[PDB]
Amino acid sequence: SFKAQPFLVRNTILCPNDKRSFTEYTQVIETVSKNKVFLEQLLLANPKLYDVMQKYNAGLLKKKRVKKLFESIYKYYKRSYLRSTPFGLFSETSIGVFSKSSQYKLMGKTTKGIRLDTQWLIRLVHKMEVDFSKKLSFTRNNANYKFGDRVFQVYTINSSELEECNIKYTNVYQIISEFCENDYQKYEDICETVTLCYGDEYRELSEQYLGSLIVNHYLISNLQKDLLSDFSWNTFLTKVEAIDEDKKYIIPLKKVQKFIQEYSEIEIGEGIEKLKEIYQEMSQILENDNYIQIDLISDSEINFDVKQKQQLEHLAEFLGNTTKSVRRTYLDDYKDKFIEKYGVDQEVQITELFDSTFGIGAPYNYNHPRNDFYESEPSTLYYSEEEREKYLSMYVEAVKNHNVINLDDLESHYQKMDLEKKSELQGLELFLNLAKEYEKDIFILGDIVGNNNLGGASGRFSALSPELTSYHRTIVDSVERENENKEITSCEIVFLPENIRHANVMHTSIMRRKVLPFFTSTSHNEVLLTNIYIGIDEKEKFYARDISTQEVLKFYITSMYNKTLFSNELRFLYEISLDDKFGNLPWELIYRDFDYIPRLVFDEIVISPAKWKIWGRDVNSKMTIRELIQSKEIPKEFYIVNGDNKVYLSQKNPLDMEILESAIKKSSKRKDFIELQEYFEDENIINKGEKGRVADVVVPFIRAFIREKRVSVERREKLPFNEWLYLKLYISINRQNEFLLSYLPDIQKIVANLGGNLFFLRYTDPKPHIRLRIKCSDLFLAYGSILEILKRSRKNRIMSTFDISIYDQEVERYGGFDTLELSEAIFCADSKIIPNLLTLIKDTNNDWKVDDVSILVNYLYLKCFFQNDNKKILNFLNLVGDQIFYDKNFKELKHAIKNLFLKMIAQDFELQKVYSIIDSIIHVHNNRLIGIERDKEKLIYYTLQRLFVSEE
């Protein structure tokens, strides 16, 4: 069902058949320092490091800096030959296709895709924003958001540091910000708008206050419009020129554009001095540790077999199938927290949602910021207990037998599972390394593996050529067409990273309808952060909606930017926008702590290479590092895995053994371990001058929303002793019924004399208690009078404590404050009858017991709401003992119901609004009469279904 798209092919420039071996570190500096290609590769990728090498060769480098210089150069050398991952001048990106025969050979021609370093560029514009503010115009940073008397940002920048900063919401912030909320406004008019309702006396302060917003990036200048998303030398230069009267910046900038254009046609090896010129003209303007990024594209076209295509599609299905066993994620627990705080009827402003003092904070696994109240880890279930026994069983036998682990064993388990549920997953990107074993070509799955973010691996390369833009457009038009069916507005999050070093990762082309920007601005239609509201589907699924247009939103980050790095709210918007189950493969999770893991394989694919964990503590005086790794039967060629990258080593090469001894002694310092992986021969598959290249590939594969905007706390919260008084009475479950018999009616009698009315509820969490809510006109006097009854229940050890709490009304659930109040009259009437029903259930002269009263009362409710019309009653029911009727309390309840029923008719409530509200009112009756119990509430409806049919 998964179809393998045309893929990206990534390969080295240099060829590993030309790799030289080495025995000494000085020998490596000697060779490398007259290797024309290497030094251009080094000067471009790692300027600072390249200069340290110069410094050493000149004798100017301090001794303590030398081991690091030696190791970094050796590792960078290995990499320019052995590591195909695409990065400027080491390796190149091309497009590959599926045909009838494999074509592992590159006829194409290599070209340099060249951007400015993005940290350099932004750091310049920020310098222009302060120097030239009086000649610029400004807009509001979408990152800003009001919160009480403060203005916050979803993240912070200028303090070149790591600390968050917020400002006061002043009258002057209000004027300035609302004035710039939708367009750009000239410095002078911003200043004018302030003085025009303060006085010209204040023009000093206005300018200062305005400048301080600009330093702290509460405002964005027009130099930043499209500056990170679609940069144009024309548009940029003409605004700088318009700004720069003393020609300080234009001309060097024109020279830089020239020198880069000249650099574009030079070969790889020959441009060292042209590059030196670029760095020189750019370092004069403003210094930065990097000045240029290059992505090398080719126009070659690698081909794969029809069998190969089938092998990959087979692998995609197996991997996607395992997500079938992900029953409860960290985000599911968050959905539950959501529903407990908000119910299902509210939509919540996203910045209110994630507030840990006023909302529910974040998913347990979010760290920006981590929750600042304590909470223990929730239950998750990413695989079953049966699955885990199989995996451990598979693990134990493979180690006992010196075998690999064939995941094939469970392929028929996972494809079989849940053939009923319609799989959510739209597609996959997979990352694969090409190698060989026993002269046969094999695929090896990257340790990154892949993801379900379609177009993520190609978005960076989209703009660099038309063929690439076409490619990317195809990949994401399978998502955009489906968004269009479902009437969902897609939306790219476009942002300056919080740590601006990472600013070159964020690049992609905007293929969506709208844009959500932060610390930048574009020309697209843009969503306001504080217009995003979160709710819950008919299927208890998180969705996002723009409160100004009522559009439903899905958000995208079509790049390889680490998603766990974001501010919680942005990470959340991203995560609710795809299908939350791909991610945690069971073998990764279950085998994680073993220090030897066999190779994992699946249908000739190497899912995961053999993996070791070597421990610092094990290198002993009776044991060096080389018989340690020999005591663990480490192959003669292996990788040491650092993080992002890995370093090739051989036991035969003594330099490789020095790097390892270095590695092992660093970890003996922290008292942890290093990670070794087995080596695959990977050099002579793809080729060029019939010389191999190291290669890898990236294959892609292919309602009636009600809900109401949440009501403010000012309107929903009822404060103690104003209109209501609300007590939590901490009474055990076994004694609540006794309290409801022998104490509550003395409390009801009291509040009656004072002309009021009360309703109660049973609630656990934290500990079990009864929520007593009294509405009455002299509440301090009613508190006084019932305090005697409560003391009596403390003495008899039925209640331990009480609190007086804020009554948070459920306005949205019960239909607005009008139908809410009528619901509350139903609550209080239901509460008057309960002690009498309990006394009938308790008396044995009766021989009616608790389940008889429950179906009966439930029967009378339905007879009230639908006015004895049995056919309507069964309408409601399909979709989910005479003296109580002549009881005076029940007559009062029956009026309370007629009155709610009338107002719902008056205000034209859609009918499912009425069905949900009657379900709620019957739900809290059951709470009151019997347990806080799940589903035994629901099976009452089933038997009432039977009794009503019989009336006919």
Binding site: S159, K168, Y202, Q208, Y209
Partner: peptide
């Protein structure tokens, strides 16, 4: 008045 402040504040990252 002095609602031109700004009041920038920045933050980092018992009993018994």
């Amino acid at each position: 008045t002095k609602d031109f402040n700004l009041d920038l504040v920045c933050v980092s990252k018992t009993x018994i």
